[PDB]
Structures are given as C-alpha cells and as structure tokens.
Write a protein that binds this ligand. Structure first.
Ligand SMILES: *Cc1c(COP(=O)(O)O)cnc(C)c1O
Ligand SMILES: *Cc1c(COP(=O)(O)O)cnc(C)c1O
Lengths: 405, 405
C-alpha cells in the first residue's frame, strides 16, 4: 500500500511557502516536482563522475557512456519496448514529435495524402503536423469531440481512407484527463496501413504503459512530467520503422564517416538520431526518476490517485456554479471554470491562497474553442497531493465565488 | 591575479581517484568539469523554486519565468549582444547550427548557390551544411589548411563569388587550438553580401567574446564546455536576421494562435524558436556558470592558461619522437602523436596513469585526413589544470615511449 506522507517527505519543494502560506502545488500536469533521489543523482554525477560520453578512452568517459546506455535500457523496460535500441533521447515530447514529423514524415507523406489528429491534442501534437502538411501538400484531418470530452469515434470511417498515412493521437488529455482507446484505434489504423504516433506525456506517470501491447509505431513522453529533470524525453520507434528513417539533426556522433569530397555516411539507429553532446545530466536524473516511480509501483500510484480524484470530484459538488470539462473517469487533471469569472481571476485568487493551479488555454486552443471558452482552470492531483489540499481548493473556490459573485 | 589552488577547490571532481591514482583531467575541450556553485544552483532550483515556466499565473511559475529571462539577459551581456532577444536557448552548439541551417538556410540558399566552410571544422559545423546543400542543390566549398594548422587565406578570392550565401567558420579549433581571424574574414564575407555563422564552442571559455565587434550574423556555443550543465547552449542571431527567420520546431509556446481550420500563426523572435518546455534546470545552471567565469575574469583566465600552455610546450620538447599539430600560439588544446604508436594505445597508457586525454578523430575527420593520420591525442589545459599535471603528462609520454619503442 501507498503512504502519501512518506512520499511527500522525499519532495523538498512541498515544504515551501508561497505568499506567506503553505504551498499546495496542483500543477504537476504542467511539470512535476522532483524527489531528492532524482535531484541528488544528477548532482552526484556532476560531483564525482562527470565526463564527455562518446565511448571515450579514459575511465570517467567510458563509465559515463555506460551510465547513459543503462538509462536507455531501463527506459525501454519501463515502457516494455522489445529493445533498448528502439529508444531515442530527445529534449522532450515536443522535440520527439518534431523528429518523427521530419525524419519519417518527409519521406512517407506525399501530396494528396492525409494525416489524422484529434481535436483534444496538445499543440505539440498539432503544429508539427500542420508544418508537415504545408511542406508536402497533404491534408490534416481531425477527430471531433463529444460534449463529455471523449472522441466521436463514429466519424473514423469518414476520416480513414487509403491515403491516410498517420494517426497522431493523445494517450491521455492534458486538459480533460480523458484516456483514449489506443489499442482499438491502432488496430483500425493498421488495417489501412497507417502508422500511429501516440503522445504519452500525460500517461506514463499515472499507470503502467506497454508499447508492445498497444502496438503503436511511435510513443513519446517527457522526463519533467515523470518527476524527472527538465531537458530530457524519450521517443520510442518500432525497430523496423526506425532503421529506415533518415537523420534529422546532423553533426558529431551520428556519423559513420565524414568526407568533404566523398560525402558523409550515417551510423545505426538510435545513435543516428542523437547529434552532438547528449544531455547526460538529464539522462542520469531521468534514470533515477524511473527507479523512484518503479519503487513506489505505478499500480499503487494509480490506486492512490484514483481515490484522490474521486474524493475531489465528490467535494467539488459543493461549489456553486462550478463547470467541469471532461469525463467522470478523468485521470490526473480537473479542468473547470467558476461561474462567469475569468479563469485568470480564479487562478490569481487561488495563488493568493498559496494554491498553484494553471489557467489559460493549456496549449490546447482547438479544445478551448470546441467548448466556446477562451480559457479554463486546471488542477492536477499527483501522487504527492493530499485530501487536505483538495479541501483548500474547494474552500477557496467557495470564498472566491462569494467575494466575486 | 589568478589562484589555481583556490579555483580547483571549487571543483569536486578534481579530488577523484581513477584506477587508484589521482585524476589529471586533461579533457575539458570535450567537456568541462563543473564548480559546485553551478551544481548547487541547479540543485537548489529543483529543491526550492521548481515550476513550469510559461508566464504561468502562480508564484513559483512566474518566478521561474523571470529566472530564465534573466539568464537570457546575462548571456547576452556575456557576449555583448545588443539585445537579450537576439539569444535563442538550444541544446548546444550542434542544435544551434542545425536550427540556422534549416530555418535560415532553407529560405536563403537556392540551387546554384555556394556555402563556404573550412577544412578544420568540427562535424557539427560540416554535416548540417552538407545536408542543406543536398536539400536545395547548392555547393559546399572548403578553405584549405596550411601545414602549421592555419587557414590558407590566399584561396578566399577563388571561393567567394556573388553566389556565396554563407561562411561558416570556427572561432577556435577544438583540435589545433588555432584561432581564426574572424573580424577580417567577416568584413570580406559581407562585401559579397554573405552571412557568417561563427562556431564559438571553443572560444567563450578562453577569452572575452564580443559579437558586436566581430559583426558576425550568427554565433553558437555550448554550456557544458563553459563549466556549465549539459543540455543547454546559446545561439546568437542579429535581430534583423532573426525576426525574418521562420520557425524550425513547432509546438507549444512558439505559437500566437492555433486553429484547425484557420491555420496557425507564430509569436515573436527568440520565443518563436523555442518549442515545448525549455531545459529550465540547464538554463539556471548556465547562468551560474556565467557568473562564476565572470567573477574569475576571462582576462585572468586567459593569462593563467597562456602561461600554462607555454610551460607545457616547453616541457614537451623533452619527449622523444613527439609530433605536434597546429600553431605555436594554440589556445587550450595540444594535439599530438607519439612516435609511430597509435593514439588509442598512448591514451590507454595515459588513462592507466590516471591522466584523462582524448584520442581518435575528435569529430574532425577532414582535419585528420589533411594530416594523413587516422587519429590524434589531445590534451586540454583548462583554468583548473596545474604545472604538476603537465609534468605527469610529459613523464607519462616518456615512459610510454621507452616501454613501447
Ligand atoms: C564540442 C564542439 C562542438 C559540439 O558542441 P556540442 O555541445 O556537442 O553540441 C562544435 N564545435 C566545436 C568547435 C566544439 O569544440
Ligand atoms: C506537456 C505535454 C506536452 C509537451 O511536452 P514538453 O515536455 O513541453 O515537450 C505534449 N503533450 C502533452 C499531452 C503534454 O501534457
């Protein structure tokens, strides 16, 4: 069983004071706080083992190379990829989607083709496809939303045809908390010979993830939402697809030979997609974050978070004029608006109480437009949040409503 | 005046033992060790101030945004750019060169044009231009080398013509330690209406750098060679050029509006080139590294390093059959080969003595080919290296020569 008090004791920021009051950090979906196991793994690497990591000859560099390839292996086991060499280190979900859009998209999507996204997608999983469509002259098609925040799956027959090259779809919405039926949608997509990129930035911290059972062709997520350091993420690509993809960035470490008269040749996958010095510090910290989450157990995390969410939804019923967005089985986040007040004002009052929520369009403007609002408030309920913090949020919304109503 | 013993006391890795013997880290040109001021600035941010940084409403996020924009301002003053908004945060020199090659290259280099590089360039400043030339059908021209490791500047009239769009040139060679006459070459390049990208990865830690006096159009360098964390670098672009450049990566934070029916519009420079969550941890640490270097004084650093280099070159005269590569006024690095022994073996023996040097082609295969060797050894003499470490290197080369000769 899970003990939130033992977990919170690992997170030094949770002691912080904001505006003179104790912090209630409800914004983990934007970025998670980090346990000291993660902070100290990075610091300890810089203090005792730091070196360049390109199979250098001397000891520190050879050992640093081995630490980095061990994190690649550990990350691959975490998502149950067949092979560590199916994982590419990127700066984050965004860069990983851009790498696919360029390396695989430019050589597999031609004029007259179409790509399918959904209306709930984060901008990271929209803009790179808009750019690709403009480069090659293809069409971007959109799975629309139902009022409860789920996909209208009945529209799929009109959107998939023989020219559909790619479905790019979110595993879990960063605003609605909707989880999409990935396994079925992927089966449908593969019947037309389309590939599927899955945006998993909001999934990997809430429950186990298994890319072999999903059978997705690409999967991406970010370290910093997985209780890890900034500047590091994972792109998973099926081995058969990955060894056909050309390089994106060029430079050191991704070449096999460089000649100014005979041209340049590339090295093998993963490493052909990693140009220049990697973010070794971030990679070490990411490994520690995966060890930490695995030590708690994603199933224990999922159970505690689901209970916390049901408590919060039960308590928020007593907030007058609260509008919620998304399904009742939401994971992780609660998107809401308070009466007619602008989200920006609600968030400012909540910050004044020491409660950190996020306001605005949440990098999902098409989703905001579907609901005909300019912005929403969003509260994240992560594994280190407590019933008392939910109570502070409910009380605060009540006070804001009395004061401003 | 400079005190190497007070400086070394800030670097915890310099106490390390390698193979049972005290480390002599002579590989800073591949990546520098970090002072605890840098390690602790990053750790302290994660411990007390961590949050997402996109002008979020709550306190932690607003303060994190301000820390990041302050580091941008500090970096801009460090290289004497006119404006902080001329600096783009990238993963490193390599990504910065790839960003220029794509965003500016694709819309300014057309079939029939030429680009000029030099024969001493790091792969980071070759491969992105080879890729660009293949994309648009332009020609890559090369300034050749003299035997002493300087550029043959007499060839410039045959290489610059009215179709030359870009000179991409290293400020300081990572192998030879040659410093190139940037100011004059830039004057020549601008007379033909060519832009100049300067690869400054090996310059910013050895002496002051002033992009207004250079008048370069682009300048790039990496945090991790500047005693800072991995995963962070700086790309400087002249404001007039930068506000004309289209985006490269797409996603959150670089858009102004996103619409699935009316298309997407971009935000203003710097920020239009920064998609997704930035590497906030790296940015904080980079700021501390700049404060640290500025507190020592780059002129004090330059003086101590120049003295150390002259001592080393004087001592290495007593090593039999030592071949050196590059000019006598080299900065930072000494590239050498020992008799007929392969660099790999020399480096392995030196590692066995606890001396970390680098061996191989140093991400500069065209440079190796010019000298008709497959590899070289390279010793870096950074601000925290000592006369005693030079003595260990000289003694070691002598022992290796006796043993293997
Ligand atoms: C090391 C170096 C690079 C590559 O920088 P990264 O940090 O690996 O992206 C490019 N040019 C020179 C001269 C270098 O020394
Ligand atoms: C935050 C997030 C992203 C963006 O990830 P970055 O780390 O900023 O690159 C993309 N998709 C979803 C669903 C997210 O929650």
């Amino acid at each position: 069983i899970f003990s939130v008090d033992k977990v919170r004791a690992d997170f030094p920021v949770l002691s912080r004071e904001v505006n003179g009051l104790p912090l209630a950090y409800l914004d983990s979906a934007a970025s998670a706080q980090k346990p000291s196991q993660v902070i100290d793994a990075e610091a300890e690497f810089y203090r005792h083992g730091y070196a360049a990591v390109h199979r250098g000859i001397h000891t520190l560099s050879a050992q640093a190379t081995e630490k980095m390839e061990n994190v690649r292996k550990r990350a691959s086991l975490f998502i149950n990829a067949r092979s560590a060499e199916e994982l590419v280190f990127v700066r984050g979900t965004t860069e990983g989607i851009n790498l696919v859009a360029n390396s695989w998209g430019n050589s597999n999507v031609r004029a007259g083709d179409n790509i399918i996204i959904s209306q709930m997608e984060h901008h990271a999983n929209i803009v790179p496809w808009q750019m690709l469509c403009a480069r090659v002259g293809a069409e971007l098609r959109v799975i629309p939303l139902n009022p409860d925040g789920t996909l209208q799956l009945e529209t799929l027959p009109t959107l998939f045809d023989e020219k559909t090259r790619l479905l790019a779809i979110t595993h879990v919405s960063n605003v609605l908390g909707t989880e999409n039926p990935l396994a079925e949608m992927i089966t449908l997509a593969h019947q037309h010979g389309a590939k599927v990129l899955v945006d998993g930035a909001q999934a990997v911290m809430h429950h186990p993830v298994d890319v072999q059972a999903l059978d997705c062709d690409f999967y991406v997520f970010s370290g910093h939402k997985l209780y890890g350091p900034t500047g590091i993420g994972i792109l998973y690509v099926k081995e058969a697809l990955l060894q056909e993809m050309p390089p994106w960035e060029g430079g050191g470490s991704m070449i096999a030979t460089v000649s100014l008269s005979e041209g340049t040749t590339w090295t093998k996958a993963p490493w052909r997609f990693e140009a220049g010095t990697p973010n070794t510090g971030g990679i070490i910290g990411l490994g520690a974050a995966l060890e930490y989450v695995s030590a708690l157990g994603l199933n224990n995390i999922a159970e505690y978070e689901q209970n916390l969410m049901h408590y919060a939804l039960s308590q928020l019923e007593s907030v007058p004029d609260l509008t919620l967005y998304g399904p009742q089985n939401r994971l992780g986040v609660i998107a809401f608006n308070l009466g007619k007040h602008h989200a920006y004002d609600v968030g400012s009052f909540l910050d004044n109480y020491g409660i950190a929520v996020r306001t605005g369009h949440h990098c999902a403007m098409p989703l905001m437009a579907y609901y005909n609002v300019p912005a929403m408030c969003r509260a994240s309920l992560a594994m280190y949040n407590t019933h008392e913090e939910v109570d502070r949020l409910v009380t605060g919304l009540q006070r804001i409503h009395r004061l401003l109503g």
